[PDB]
Design a protein around this ligand. Structure first.
Ligand SMILES: [Mg+2]
Ligand SMILES: [Mg+2]
Ligand SMILES: [Mg+2]
Ligand SMILES: [Zn+2]
Lengths: 162, 166, 152, 287, 108
């Protein structure tokens, strides 16, 4: 279906383009380039990437890809979604409004395995990141620097704790 | 109308260098168009000015003025947003750096007097502003001792010059 | 100058004061716990104690019956006064009422208090309790007491 | 020299702190649940070996920090500044609890430690002072006791009222300084390395290592003052409000050495006693 | 009498910021050991008092339902019994107010 709609697509050549799109989108997140983000990721992706990062600086950098990226699953007014498994190595450093580090290390690289789902709209559409599937068996993410308090039930006077 | 206080929370500072003191977090909050006189609100603002968040809440919970409840609600909202969005680790580790009351947009009404005469009432509204700064409240300025006071006097004496001469 | 004046000036006059106290005291007899402005509760506490004494006097006492009839505007409470409260306090000689200040009224920030007859069926008030005997200061004072007792 | 001894002891203490904190790199998250009566159900996701019950109190409110002297972690008492080591149940203990016994003991030990520091730093250089032990006397005794052996030159010297008042002044200077009670669980080997110049402290460390299954010992510092603690201590010296070195008594078995017991009495800010009650307490503590 | 001159903002600030005007800090506030909410030392805890008042309201509503009308105050003592509780020998001969909930821990 993808080939009958486009006539110049290559599944074998897709992974390099997908990796380039991913790197460019994350660099756009780093530089707060929403205009380029809207071209590199879908409208279902952009809010997920930007909402919680608003008012904070992210220092993201891709250092290397451990194993070559390769397509995994592809399905299809008509959209086509391609799942690409990438096991690469990246860096993070997220700071507060005040420039205080709150996640990751600016230099230490970390190995990340992820499944990026790209989508395309079938005249002027293109391939843009649509989602990231997180395996239920995914290793726990890096712990946060600051401690957290989770309030218990804010009991009303009549209510009693259980 | 001006709404710069709300925008003051949107300033993003550049990342701090590792060899730099940790910048205390600042959270600006406000409530607009409170049905309360700014003059009366000023007393509550002055009361809680410079105190820790918990102490301010404690005083406001037992002060009888109407504005006390409004200021308590504003402070609670400020604490919640400081924890959720401004990366403040501890709820209690906040102090009121700034607290002021501003004039709101008021409405003019007529008060009827005895002989067909009248006065112009003003349905007074006021704004309320708070800045919460992370960290323990700054120690109160200790009263200047006799030693320092005499030191200042002696410095004044030493500063004397032969005026109006070569 | 109000030297020695022991009665507050309440209501619209002396009669209105008596009637306000009477209504508060009837409510107290009915419910065994009433929250009302602090000054009014303070003024009515003595009258509550006096009704308890008059109920102790007994049903047959015509003077006590007349006092109860006047003070209890709801006549169903006179049998209560004479058969539930006075028998309850027969052992006691005084202090039938517990009065405790309450957070100020939300409406006008009035000083309020709760007054109850002791031993009522209602849930106990959050009474203020003295520090435990096991505190540091209390233990030191217990040591003082033991030393004095051993000396004597 | 005493200054050299203090400097090297503090250096060893700091190296031990650095080693302990480096033993657990990164930030491992431990869940500590507030099993206390009020604010029930609050679970704190703290940093392991870094966060403290004081950090828990800071998360809760300022009143917790001001009023909480001890922390029961999984049923055991903890210093408010002792880092937590695992997910657990936490309950803050104040002075005015129903059964303040543990808090009383901790305050009592802390007062004894402050007395020991004052004793060691009060005497002149030419006189040797060696702190032997802080007996765990009950509060009912009316006075916390600290045992010291002074120089043989002063075998017939008894402190005067002015000397006792100077000791109280030094203790109040410490209180004004308001130093935290830093704590560590350090192996008996390092404890002996720190206290190699005090046979009394060495043998006390040996007894503690024998009592506990491992060779772990509670080592506490107020400021530039390392000491062995029988148990948990209070957060900061500023907790103390009234503090008085009441008297000194020589122990009967004087033939081996003069064990002089400094007896004092104290009360925290939360339990201030009136002037007359305090005077009576001083009279009863002078015994 | 009318003002002879407008009082300046300096004089007005003096008058209205004189510490006699300013609100006084209250040092009698303390934490309630029961619920942990703030309370003035002499005043009863607001949270605990509200608990007691709501339980009292429920009990009084049950009392009214049992009475069934005005001027029907009982001539005997009253005892409140909760779910899973039976009258004791002392409770015998006393009007039983049944509450459809577990007895509160504070209530005894
Ligand atoms: Mg007219
Ligand atoms: Mg006007
Ligand atoms: Mg009047
Ligand atoms: Zn309470």
């Amino acid at each position: 279906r993808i080939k009958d709609y486009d006539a110049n697509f290559k599944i074998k050549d897709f992974p390099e383009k997908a990796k380039d799109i991913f790197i460019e989108a994350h660099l756009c997140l780093n530089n707060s380039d929403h205009d380029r983000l809207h071209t590199l990721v879908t409208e279902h992706c952009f809010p997920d990437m930007t909402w919680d990062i608003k008012y904070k600086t992210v220092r993201w950098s891709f250092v290397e890809s451990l194993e070559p990226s390769h397509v995994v699953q592809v399905r299809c007014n008509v959209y086509g979604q391609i799942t690409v498994r990438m096991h690469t190595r990246q860096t993070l450093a997220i700071y507060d409004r005040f420039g205080r580090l709150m996640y990751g290390q600016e230099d230490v690289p970390k190995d990340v395995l992820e499944y990026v789902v790209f989508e395309k709209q079938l005249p002027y559409g293109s391939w843009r990141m649509h989602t990231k599937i997180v395996p239920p068996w995914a290793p726990p993410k890096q712990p946060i620097l600051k401690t957290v308090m989770i309030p218990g039930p804010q009991l009303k006077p009549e209510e009693e704790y259980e | 109308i001006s709404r710069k206080w709300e925008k003051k929370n949107k300033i993003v500072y550049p990342p701090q260098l590792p060899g730099e003191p940790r910048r205390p977090a600042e959270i600006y909050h406000c409530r607009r168009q409170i049905k309360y006189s700014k003059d009366k609100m000023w007393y509550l603002a002055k009361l809680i000015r410079g105190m820790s968040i918990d102490q301010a809440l404690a005083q406001l919970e037992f002060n009888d003025k109407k504005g006390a409840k409004i200021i308590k609600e504003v402070l609670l909202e400020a604490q919640d947003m400081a924890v959720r969005d401004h990366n403040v680790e501890f709820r209690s580790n906040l102090y009121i750096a700034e607290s002021t009351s501003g004039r709101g947009q008021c409405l003019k009404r007529i008060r009827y007097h005895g002989r067909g005469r009248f006065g112009i009432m003003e349905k007074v509204y006021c704004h309320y502003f708070v800045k919460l700064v992370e960290g323990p409240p700054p120690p109160p300025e200790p009263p200047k001792t006799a030693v320092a006071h005499a030191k200042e006097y002696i410095q004044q004496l030493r500063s004397r010059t032969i005026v109006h001469t070569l | 100058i109000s030297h020695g004046r022991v009665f507050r000036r309440m209501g619209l006059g002396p009669e209105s004061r008596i009637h306000l106290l009477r209504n508060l005291l009837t409510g107290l007899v009915r419910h065994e716990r009433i929250e009302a402005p602090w000054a009014r509760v303070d003024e009515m506490r003595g009258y509550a104690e006096k009704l308890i004494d008059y109920g102790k006097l007994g049903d047959t006492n015509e003077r006590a019956m007349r006092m109860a009839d006047f003070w209890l505007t709801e006549k169903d409470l006179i049998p209560k006064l004479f058969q539930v409260l006075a028998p309850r306090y027969k052992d006691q000689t005084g202090g039938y009422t517990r009065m405790l200040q309450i957070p100020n009224r939300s409406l006008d920030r009035a000083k309020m208090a709760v007054i109850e007859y002791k031993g009522n069926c209602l849930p106990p008030l959050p009474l203020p309790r003295r520090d435990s005997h096991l505190t540091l200061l209390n233990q030191l004072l217990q040591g003082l007491r033991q030393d004095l007792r051993q000396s004597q | 020299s005493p200054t050299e001894l203090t400097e090297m002891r503090n250096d060893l203490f700091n190296k031990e702190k650095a080693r302990q904190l480096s033993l657990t790199p990164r930030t491992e998250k431990i869940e500590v649940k507030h099993v206390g009566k009020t604010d029930p159900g609050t679970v704190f996701v703290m940093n392991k070996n870094i966060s403290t019950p004081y950090s828990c109190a800071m998360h809760l409110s300022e009143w917790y920090c001001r009023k909480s002297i001890l922390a029961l972690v999984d049923g055991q008492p903890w210093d408010m500044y002792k880092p937590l080591t695992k997910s657990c149940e936490i309950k803050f203990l104040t002075f005015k609890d129903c059964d303040p016994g543990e808090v009383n003991k901790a305050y009592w030990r802390s007062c004894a430690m402050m007395m020991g520091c004052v004793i060691e730093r009060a005497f002149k250089d030419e006189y040797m002072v060696n702190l032997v032990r802080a007996p765990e006397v009950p509060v009912i005794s009316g006075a916390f006791c600290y045992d010291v052996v002074l120089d043989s030159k002063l075998d017939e010297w008894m402190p005067t009222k002015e000397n006792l008042r100077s000791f109280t002044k030094d203790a109040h200077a410490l209180i004004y300084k308001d130093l935290p009670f830093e704590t560590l669980e350090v192996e008996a080997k390092v404890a002996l390395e720190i206290f190699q110049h005090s046979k009394y402290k060495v043998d006390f460390i040996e007894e503690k290592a024998s009592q506990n299954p491992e060779r772990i010992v509670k080592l506490h510092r107020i400021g530039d003052f390392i000491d062995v603690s029988e148990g948990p201590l209070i957060p900061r010296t500023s907790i103390c409000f009234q503090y008085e070195v009441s008297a000194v008594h020589n122990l009967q078995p004087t033939q081996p050495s003069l064990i002089r017991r400094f007896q004092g009495v104290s009360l925290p800010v939360h339990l201030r006693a009136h002037f007359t009650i305090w005077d009576k307490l001083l009279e009863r503590s002078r015994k | 009498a009318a003002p002879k001159n407008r009082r300046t903002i300096e004089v007005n600030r003096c008058r209205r910021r004189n510490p006699q005007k300013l609100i006084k800090v209250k040092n009698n506030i303390d934490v309630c050991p029961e619920c942990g909410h703030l309370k003035q030392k002499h005043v009863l805890c607001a949270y605990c008092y509200e608990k007691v008042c709501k339980e009292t309201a429920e009990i009084r509503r049950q009392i009214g339902k049992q009475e069934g009308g005005p001027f029907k105050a009982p001539t005997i003592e009253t005892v409140v019994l909760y779910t899973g509780e039976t009258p004791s020998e002392q409770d015998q001969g006393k009007r039983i107010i049944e509450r459809d909930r577990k007895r509160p821990s504070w209530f005894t």
